[PDB]
Amino acid sequence: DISAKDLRNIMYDHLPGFGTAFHQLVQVICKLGKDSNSLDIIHAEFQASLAEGDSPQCALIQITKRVPIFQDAAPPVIHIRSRGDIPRACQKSLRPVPPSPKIDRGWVCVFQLQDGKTLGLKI
Amino acid sequence: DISAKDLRNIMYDHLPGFGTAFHQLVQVICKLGKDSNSLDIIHAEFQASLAEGDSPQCALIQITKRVPIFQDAAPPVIHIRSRGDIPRACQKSLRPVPPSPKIDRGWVCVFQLQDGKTLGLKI
Ligand SMILES: Cc1cccc(C(=O)C2=C(O)C(=O)N(c3ccc(CC(=O)O)cc3)[C@H]2c2cc(Cl)c3c(c2)OCO3)c1
Numbered sequence: 001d002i003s004a005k006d007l008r009n010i011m012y013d014h015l016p017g018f019g020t021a022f023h024q025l026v027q028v029i030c031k032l033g034k035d036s037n038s039l040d041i042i043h044a045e046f047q048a049s050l051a052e053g054d055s056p057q058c059a060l061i062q063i064t065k066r067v068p069i070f071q072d073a074a075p076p077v078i079h080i081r082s083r084g085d086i087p088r089a090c091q092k093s094l095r096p097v098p099p100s101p102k103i104d105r106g107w108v109c110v111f112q113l114q115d116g117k118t119l120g121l122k123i
Numbered sequence: 124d125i126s127a128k129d130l131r132n133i134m135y136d137h138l139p140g141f142g143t144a145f146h147q148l149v150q151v152i153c154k155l156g157k158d159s160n161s162l163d164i165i166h167a168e169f170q171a172s173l174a175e176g177d178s179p180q181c182a183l184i185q186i187t188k189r190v191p192i193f194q195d196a197a198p199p200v201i202h203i204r205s206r207g208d209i210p211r212a213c214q215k216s217l218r219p220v221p222p223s224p225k226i227d228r229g230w231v232c233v234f235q236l237q238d239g240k241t242l243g244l245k246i
Pocket residue numbers: 004005024027028030031032034076077078079080085086087109
């Protein structure tokens with residue numbers, strides 16, 4: 001059986017750069033996947049998209065649009081201290097949070113900072 | 124000017140018992156009120172409701188219906204370890220989280236537990 005850590009490693013293996021918004025999307029997919037006992041179907045979808053010739057980035061986005069736990073889903077809230085806790089390669093992807101953000105519309109997660117500031121990570 | 128702690132103490136002084144769902148609603152009102160620089164209007168609405176003869180419980184609900192930061196607002200996510208971090212008097216008000224919980228519909232907050240469990244506090 002595949003673990004959340006295994007799936008993270010598999011997905012990271014295909015991504016360029018490091019600490020990018022796509023790496024964070026992997027984290028979200030793995031966390032929500034684990035919490036919904038869906039790591040296997042998610043892995044199968046990822047591999048199937050790659051096998052069709054999709055970019056790994058598109059494979060991750062297709063998971064958000066095809067696997068039902070992400071469809072019309074609000075992004076998870078992640079509590080952190082400051083913007084400094086977020087990798088450099090994610091910084092320019094941070095945005096003010098819109099009213100109903102949705103994972104399948106590119107809103108990966110919402111970071112809540114210790115002083116109450118709130119930023120959404122957008123792809 | 125009134126602080127979030129001052130307001131919390133004022134509201135607690137009107138509520139019977141301790142650690143109830145209404146005490147948690149005070150916490151949410153004061154935190155969100157502080158983050159939106161809205162403690163003054165919140166206090167004014169609370170006092171006005173009491174002055175019309177409303178119960179302090181209803182005055183708190185009135186705040187969620189009358190102060191625009193709570194109108195059609197999703198409940199805040201609060202990260203905790205387990206149900207053991209929630210006071211005894213709130214336990215029976217914890218519910219599975221519905222698709223679109225709203226503060227002004229009685230969904231005070233969403234507790235996210237460390238193992239991935241999620242519970243909404245409902246009034
Ligand atoms: C930039 C940053 C700061 C702080 C946290 C994170 C982050 O995404 C996560 C972790 O540091 C982490 O350990 N997460 C995680 C991912 C999958 C599992 C499933 C498992 O292996 O048991 C567990 C933890 C990340 C994480 C991802 C999400 Cl969606 C979270 C979260 C943490 O808390 C609330 O929602 C990212």
